[PDB]
Amino acid sequence: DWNYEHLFMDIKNKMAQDSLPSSVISAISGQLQSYSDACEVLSVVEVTLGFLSTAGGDPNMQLNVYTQDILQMGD
Amino acid sequence: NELLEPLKNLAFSPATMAHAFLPTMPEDLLAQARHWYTCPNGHPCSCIDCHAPDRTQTGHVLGNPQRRDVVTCDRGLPPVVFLLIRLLTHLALLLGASQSSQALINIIKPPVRDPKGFLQQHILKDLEQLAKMLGHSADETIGVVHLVLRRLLQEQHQLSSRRLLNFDTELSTKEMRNNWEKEIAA
Amino acid sequence: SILDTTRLLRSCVQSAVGMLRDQNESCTRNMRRVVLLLGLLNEDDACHASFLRVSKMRLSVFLKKQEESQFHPLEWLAREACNQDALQEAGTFRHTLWKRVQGAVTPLLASMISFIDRDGNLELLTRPDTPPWARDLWMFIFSDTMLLNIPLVMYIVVQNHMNLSENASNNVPFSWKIKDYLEELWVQAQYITDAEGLPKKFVDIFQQTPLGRFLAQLHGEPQQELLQCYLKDFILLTMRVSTEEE
Amino acid sequence: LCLDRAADFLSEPMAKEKQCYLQQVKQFCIRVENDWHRVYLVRKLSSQRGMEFVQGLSKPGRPHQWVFPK
Amino acid sequence: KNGKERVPILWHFLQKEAELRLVKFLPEILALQRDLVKQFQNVQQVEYSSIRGFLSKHSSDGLRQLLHNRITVFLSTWNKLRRSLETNGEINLPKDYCSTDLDLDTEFEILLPRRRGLGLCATALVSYLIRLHNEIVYAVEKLSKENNSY
Ligand SMILES: [Zn+2]
């Protein structure tokens, strides 16, 4: 039942958002020839969405740097 | 006098007053003052609980007479005058109950089985309140009620003309009732 | 052993913290909680070891209680093998199972973190200037299952009682629980006693508790410092204060 | 003020100590013979309940006939 | 004696006295609701049938009797003000809620001041009391000529 919409509105209020460039879309589309890998990536995106919605962050910060350094979300 | 007609309808022809507004009622002050806002789905908000940014009644809505400890008037009338108006209303309602009980059972909310007794108890509580307010003996209080009724009997030949009576004999609305209250008080 | 629970906890820390929302709207809290938990969840010093052990124990307790409300809790592996959605999401069976255990543990870990880290508690474990008595009392309370009653739950709101600032911490571990416990013992002594004897009866009742005996073991200067910290925490729990001089 | 308190206790349409007080008032009214006191008591009752209640209390077979003067 | 102009504070106070006397309870009612929130916050299902059951679980004598006393205060205040809340209060309330008196057999949800369900009643009372206090305070400001609002 998670109301993702509220999280999205909170984030947009806290930070800026932009659409994916076609290049990134094609790259991820090519790389993600597997449902499992998609789910893994989406789980990382969901955790990031939660943290950003609460705290926030630099819209230009790379997502991998944010997850690995700040969230320590390795492993 | 046309001013009496509403009360007379209560006494002799209560069936008409079924959907009529009676001075024996409070109003929704919230609708009249036009803090808590409200969401589109209906929950208050001073968004919260969703994350998205008339109560006035007809008929006799006063409940058990035992609760009637004090009299309050929001329409700017003095408590004493509102009390007397309400008492006249209860007398008319008792007359109507004598004419047809079912009509009063329909008009009374929540419903009741003994309109006559219910109205008697309300009248007694009215007298107790009058006594507390003015500070006169019980007999002097009943005398005050008779004096007011006498004034109303006299103030017709002098008040049958040159009047500004913005009310209908059935008090079909809220403003008609308020206006009748003000004229009576005057 | 069968499973490396330490690693599973460490893997679920980020998701659990991510489930926590605060009243005070202290944005930078969750990140610090993540850092603190990843630091504490170790077997380096005995404090970290005991924190990890008590966490694992309380998780086992919550899981046992939840299991006792369901049929055949041993068949969980089988149930996972019956969930094609979980299989295809996970890829391998081992990973399906690992994700299942992560999903089970994340809510309960989040709840427990909401309880322990109410105002700023966890800083006391990490701040090296924290006196020994503070860490000892922290772990004593966290280990107790009837003093720190944590009810099960099936967004999580961290009930901040103080209006403390960022990165600040309550001067005494679990001051809110100690206050509530002492008020309960007060109510009980009051109704059991007359206006006289209530002081002595209340002091005795407290001294006979585990917590009272523990604090009784503290002797000398540490005990004075303890009382001072509780005074400050007590005020902040009771009264709103505008300045530190007040 | 004592007579007022008795008048209130009587005006009610059921406790022992209040009855003790009413009995002491009865003895005081009978003993002192300043019937003015009873006049005030009667007057107070009329204020609260009305003249008919007092007339009823004057009738035979009543418990409060002491309220009245000779 | 033309009190509205000559004495506005006395006039308003006398008008609302019946209800203003009940403003004294609000510390206790607030504490009750705050403790109930503390207990039930983060809880999803609420399986308590009534107040009598809830009390029976909190059967420790001191705690049982303190909760009972507090709930009694709340129920008394509600019973008195309910017919006022039905028309005034800025929070809409179905007539069924205000229609009858409450007792220990009443639903427990009435005590939880959520924005939906019977808990609006717990909210409404807390709001309507506050209104009375605030409103009379405004009158003093209107006669203070100052801005001491804290
Ligand atoms: Zn809302």
Side-chain angles (χ1 to χ4, degrees):
Chain A
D1 294 32
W2 212 310
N3 181 21
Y4 278 98
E5 183 167 2
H6 158 270
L7 301 172
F8 291 3
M9 288 317 299
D10 283 55
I11 298 156
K12 289 172 177 177
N13 293 359
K14 289 209 181 61
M15 316 166 28
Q17 294 280 305
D18 203 357
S19 159
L20 307 184
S22 41
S23 57
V24 177
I25 300 180
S26 267
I28 298 181
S29 78
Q31 290 179 282
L32 300 190
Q33 290 282 305
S34 178
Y35 180 100
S36 194
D37 296 69
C39 298
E40 295 159 53
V41 175
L42 180 53
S43 71
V44 182
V45 181
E46 284 192 348
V47 172
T48 304
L49 284 162
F51 281 84
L52 291 179
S53 77
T54 306
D58 175 13
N60 304 280
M61 192 165 185
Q62 287 275 357
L63 173 56
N64 58 355
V65 175
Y66 182 74
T67 52
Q68 297 175 263
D69 297 356
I70 305 200
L71 302 183
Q72 301 224 317
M73 221 170 67
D75 321 328
Chain B
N1 177 1
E2 309 87 49
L3 208 51
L4 303 191
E5 294 284 301
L7 298 176
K8 188 175 188 176
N9 286 326
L10 286 171
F12 308 109
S13 305
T16 69
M17 298 297 284
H19 305 293
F21 288 78
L22 319 175
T24 74
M25 75 190 191
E27 302 156 41
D28 187 353
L29 302 208
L30 174 60
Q32 296 295 167
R34 295 156 184 179
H35 271 272
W36 291 82
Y37 322 108
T38 205
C39 99
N41 298 305
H43 48 71
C45 51
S46 193
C47 160
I48 309 287
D49 178 28
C50 288
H51 317 306
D54 194 355
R55 284 188 293 178
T56 299
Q57 256 171 119
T58 37
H60 182 106
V61 311
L62 314 168
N64 190 310
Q66 304 156 20
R67 301 182 185 296
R68 290 254 329 287
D69 58 7
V70 193
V71 170
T72 71
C73 207
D74 45 297
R75 307 135 197 193
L77 289 124
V80 163
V81 180
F82 184 44
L83 204 178
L84 288 157
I85 288 158
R86 146 178 302 169
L87 183 46
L88 294 160
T89 309
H90 286 148
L91 289 157
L93 285 164
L94 190 45
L95 292 164
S98 86
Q99 305 300 330
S100 101
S101 36
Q102 192 59 63
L104 280 286
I105 304 171
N106 308 347
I107 286 166
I108 294 159
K109 303 169 183 171
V112 297
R113 316 196 168 182
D114 52 356
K116 166 283 198 172
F118 174 75
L119 291 174
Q120 282 193 314
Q121 292 146 0
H122 272 288
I123 292 160
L124 294 165
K125 198 81 179 66
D126 302 337
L127 290 169
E128 183 226 300
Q129 294 179 316
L130 279 165
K132 296 213 220 58
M133 298 179 162
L134 302 178
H136 291 309
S137 68
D139 291 309
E140 285 176 319
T141 303
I142 299 166
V144 180
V145 189
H146 291 286
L147 279 165
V148 164
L149 268 178
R150 159 168 182 250
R151 177 63 171 248
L152 290 174
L153 181 63
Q154 290 172 317
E155 292 255 76
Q156 38 143 320
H157 319 307
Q158 311 85 297
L159 278 67
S160 35
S161 147
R162 201 234 79 83
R163 300 271 54 234
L164 298 178
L165 307 190
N166 197 3
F167 68 80
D168 55 330
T169 53
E170 312 87 355
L171 301 189
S172 56
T173 88
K174 180 175 209 183
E175 199 200 306
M176 304 270 87
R177 173 281 321 174
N178 197 5
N179 292 343
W180 177 96
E181 284 192 80
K182 302 172 182 166
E183 287 308 306
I184 283 282
Chain C
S1 90
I2 303 298
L3 181 129
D4 196 36
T5 57
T6 292
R7 193 181 312 275
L8 187 143
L9 283 173
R10 290 176 70 67
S11 79
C12 291
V13 165
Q14 297 92 348
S15 56
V17 171
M19 304 204 59
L20 304 177
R21 279 195 47 59
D22 303 18
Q23 303 292 254
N24 287 39
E25 295 290 304
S26 322
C27 281
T28 76
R29 200 70 205 119
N30 287 341
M31 171 290 311
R32 183 66 185 299
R33 283 178 179 128
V34 172
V35 174
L36 292 163
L37 293 167
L38 297 181
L40 290 184
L41 295 165
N42 285 319
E43 245 191 354
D44 308 324
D45 50 58
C47 178
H48 301 162
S50 301
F51 169 87
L52 185 60
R53 175 172 68 246
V54 169
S55 296
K56 288 194 187 165
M57 179 273 287
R58 300 190 72 124
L59 257 296
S60 78
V61 173
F62 293 139
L63 290 164
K64 201 169 211 156
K65 246 54 68 204
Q66 291 203 130
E67 277 172 3
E68 284 141 357
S69 74
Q70 306 149 5
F71 83 119
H72 307 323
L74 287 160
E75 290 186 350
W76 67 279
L77 178 149
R79 287 194 297 280
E80 228 60 36
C82 291
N83 194 358
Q84 176 45 223
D85 287 348
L87 272 296
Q88 64 189 223
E89 285 188 353
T92 77
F93 195 43
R94 288 208 152 113
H95 197 46
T96 309
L97 294 179
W98 183 260
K99 283 171 65 73
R100 169 59 165 107
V101 184
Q102 285 185 321
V105 163
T106 292
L108 304 180
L109 179 61
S111 98
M112 185 169 59
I113 294 160
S114 144
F115 279 84
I116 70 194
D117 198 47
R118 274 284 222 264
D119 297 281
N121 232 17
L122 288 176
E123 312 303 319
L124 295 168
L125 278 176
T126 58
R127 287 201 286 98
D129 58 297
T130 296
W133 67 255
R135 287 203 190 99
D136 290 349
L137 178 55
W138 203 110
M139 283 299 316
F140 170 85
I141 296 167
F142 185 39
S143 298
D144 197 335
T145 40
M146 44 68 63
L147 171 53
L148 191 69
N149 178 32
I150 294 174
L152 263 175
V153 180
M154 315 188 72
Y155 293 55
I156 296 151
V157 189
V158 192
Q159 197 157 6
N160 307 107
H161 324 94
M162 315 168 156
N163 311 350
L164 223 64
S165 37
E166 200 67 297
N167 76 60
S169 67
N170 44 297
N171 290 62
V172 153
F174 293 101
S175 281
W176 63 270
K177 188 59 80 170
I178 301 180
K179 188 170 184 285
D180 291 355
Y181 187 72
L182 285 167
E183 287 174 6
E184 283 156 57
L185 290 183
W186 158 274
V187 161
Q188 290 169 350
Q190 186 174 3
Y191 292 27
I192 296 160
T193 324
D194 166 70
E196 308 214 312
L198 169 60
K200 193 254 177 62
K201 184 58 174 173
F202 179 53
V203 162
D204 284 357
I205 292 163
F206 177 75
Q207 282 171 294
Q208 298 310 326
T209 62
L211 175 60
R213 285 166 171 169
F214 172 83
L215 296 183
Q217 299 167 2
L218 286 89
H219 289 293
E221 304 93 354
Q223 197 179 125
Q224 288 112 46
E225 198 218 307
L226 169 67
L227 196 54
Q228 287 297 328
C229 291
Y230 195 64
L231 281 166
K232 193 244 62 175
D233 280 357
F234 178 94
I235 293 161
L236 291 183
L237 292 165
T238 305
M239 327 165 71
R240 182 141 91 169
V241 181
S242 325
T243 87
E244 187 148 0
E245 301 85 0
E246 185 178 2
Chain D
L1 295 176
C2 303
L3 293 171
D4 256 51
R5 192 79 183 237
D8 286 72
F9 292 159
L10 290 165
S11 291
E12 298 161 357
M14 195 158 52
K16 166 68 222 143
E17 322 82 0
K18 301 166 120 203
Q19 197 111 2
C20 196
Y21 181 79
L22 284 162
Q23 187 67 10
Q24 288 149 181
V25 167
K26 177 170 178 173
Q27 196 72 5
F28 157 86
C29 291
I30 292 169
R31 187 185 71 247
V32 176
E33 303 285 59
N34 201 31
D35 250 11
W36 277 122
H37 301 176
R38 283 197 178 103
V39 167
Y40 182 93
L41 188 66
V42 170
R43 280 169 170 182
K44 198 74 203 190
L45 278 166
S46 177
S47 185
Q48 293 179 279
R49 304 295 262 88
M51 187 185 72
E52 298 89 346
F53 177 83
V54 169
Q55 286 186 334
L57 291 184
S58 82
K59 285 169 187 174
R62 264 43 267 290
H64 304 145
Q65 287 216 1
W66 66 264
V67 163
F68 298 87
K70 264 67 169 287
Chain E
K1 289 173 181 172
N2 189 39
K4 190 161 197 182
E5 306 188 319
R6 185 169 160 238
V7 278
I9 311 304
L10 185 50
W11 177 88
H12 185 87
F13 176 44
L14 295 161
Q15 291 284 349
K16 263 79 191 303
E17 187 290 321
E19 290 194 348
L20 275 157
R21 60 217 278 191
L22 292 104
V23 165
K24 73 201 178 79
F25 309 138
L26 227 70
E28 257 303 299
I29 297 201
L30 281 170
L32 180 63
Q33 303 197 165
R34 171 202 73 187
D35 302 357
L36 282 167
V37 158
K38 195 180 182 189
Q39 172 171 350
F40 287 82
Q41 182 194 311
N42 299 319
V43 177
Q44 293 213 120
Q45 307 86 39
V46 173
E47 312 305 20
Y48 297 82
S49 194
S50 61
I51 318 170
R52 177 156 286 117
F54 169 73
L55 285 168
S56 75
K57 300 147 176 60
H58 291 266
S59 216
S60 180
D61 296 354
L63 176 62
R64 174 173 69 263
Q65 175 174 1
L66 175 61
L67 294 165
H68 170 78
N69 295 352
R70 290 164 111 179
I71 288 161
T72 306
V73 183
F74 181 90
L75 291 167
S76 181
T77 303
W78 173 260
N79 286 324
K80 310 180 68 185
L81 288 161
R82 64 189 178 61
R83 295 317 289 272
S84 301
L85 299 178
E86 191 176 2
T87 69
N88 329 323
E90 316 192 40
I91 290 157
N92 173 33
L93 244 67
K95 299 167 180 298
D96 41 298
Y97 297 9
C98 303
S99 85
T100 69
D101 283 332
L102 303 187
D103 54 6
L104 299 177
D105 313 302
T106 290
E107 303 298 305
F108 174 63
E109 267 283 302
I110 198 79
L111 300 177
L112 301 174
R114 44 158 46 73
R115 302 279 192 268
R116 309 193 224 143
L118 285 165
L120 281 167
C121 301
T123 319
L125 195 47
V126 162
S127 179
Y128 193 91
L129 274 311
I130 273 156
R131 284 173 50 62
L132 284 170
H133 186 305
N134 286 5
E135 190 171 58
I136 179 167
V137 161
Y138 298 163
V140 173
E141 183 165 54
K142 193 149 294 167
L143 184 134
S144 148
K145 295 73 64 209
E146 289 210 5
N147 292 26
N148 284 34
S149 325
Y150 87 106

